[PDB]
Amino acid sequence: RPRFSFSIAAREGKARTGTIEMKRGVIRTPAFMPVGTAATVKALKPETVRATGADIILGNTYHLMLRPGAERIAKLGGLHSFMGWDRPILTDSGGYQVMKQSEEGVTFMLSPERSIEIQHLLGSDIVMAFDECTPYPATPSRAASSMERSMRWAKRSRDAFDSRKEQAENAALFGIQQGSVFENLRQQSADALAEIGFDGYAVGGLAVGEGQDEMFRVLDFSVPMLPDDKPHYLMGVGKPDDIVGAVERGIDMFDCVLPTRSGRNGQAFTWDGPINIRNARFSEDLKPLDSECHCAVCQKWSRAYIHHLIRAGEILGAMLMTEHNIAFYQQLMQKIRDSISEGRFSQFAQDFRARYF
């Protein structure tokens, strides 16, 4: 395979379906990337994460630079070897979780140059530029100041990435659009990033308190500003209906802790909406978590059993809820891909929402 190639196989409106090819594997888009720790996903072995349909995972840079340390992980052969995951890994820059700020970077020092080096040491396949997620709400002036700094950091990230031969030849680099909810700043930010040039473009600065209507409003004008021929990554999103609406607006990639964190807390996703498995109504329910789901958990155990495990604080309850919720998210993405491929994504979006809500 090549270092990076994004191919769009089918379109419906602003929605797209395709593949990213990289050296470590192929990523089907639109893609959901499960997030981890030193685990590929909390409470799951890498083979389980793969079995659920994940093509790529999100490496938690902040966690890992803290302990065991990026240099240690490099010494040990890199994050793929350490974890036992041989497919692509997208690493975050560590920016969001760390947020004294200066033009140099953040002290808490994490600069664009250090961030790109740490992602190199982990052995990232998709490297994120180091940015600042502007808080919401933001005044036009603060949004502009913050976006401008982020674009300067994006150039510093590009050059740090490019100055490292092994990294430039084997990994990809994504830039991140800022500008809060303001159309003109989003345009300035898209223009700045495309001038620098990246392999993919994220939409940053959303899912930070503005709510779905506003987030969709901002995506409506913001995604068409990015290059069409590159992947579009919406950071930190989200709930199943957020994902469907974002794909309707041209998003190709997603990450969120919701399926994993929700799962350990007792929330299971189903095609009829989420359920809280601790509720007494499930104590003798012999049905699987979801009636249609293809995952190993829904083939083998009942709601009643998982209800007991979560109420009892058992680790196996966390394992089983997490495997089902990450499988549900991959089945959602497969249904989105197939529906766009078949020209029926609009109907799928409406059928999904009618049942889910």
Could you list the residues that contact ligand 0WX (CB under 6 A)? 35, 58, 60, 92, 95-96, 131, 133, 176, 204-208, 235-236, 255, 257
Q: Is the Cβ of residue 305 or residue 345 nearer to its own copies in the bound state?
A: 305
> Residue 212 CB, nearest distance to its own copies (Å)?
31
d(CA 144, CA 162): 27
333 touches, from Zn ion, its own copies, ligand 0WX, none (C-beta below 5 to 8 Å by class): none
Cβ–Cβ under 8 Å, residues 160 and 117: yes
Q: Name the site residues for Zn ion (rule: CB under 5 A).
A: 293, 295, 297-298, 324
Q: Name the site residues for its own copies (rule: CB under 8 A).
A: 37-39, 42-45, 67-68, 72, 75-77, 82-84, 283-284, 286, 300-302, 304-305, 308-309, 311-312, 314-316, 318-319
d(CA 214, CA 339): 26
290 is catalytic: no
On whether 62 is known to bind a ligand per the annotation, the reply is: no
d(CA 175, CA 232): 10
Q: Is the Cβ of residue 230 or residue 303 nearer to ligand 0WX in the bound state?
A: 230
> Residue 111 CB, nearest distance to Zn ion (Å)?
42
92 is catalytic: yes
Point out the catalytic residue in the list 55, 92, 125, 290. Answer: 92
> Quick one: how far is CA 350 from the chain centroid?
24
Q: Is the Cβ of residue 47 or residue 228 nearer to its own copies in the bound state?
A: 47
Residue set of the binding site? 92-96, 131, 178, 205, 293, 295, 298, 324
Residues tagged in the binding site annotation for Zn(2+): 293, 295, 298, 324
Binding-site annotation: residue ranges for substrate: 92-96, 131, 178, 205
Q: Which residues are catalytic?
A: 92, 255
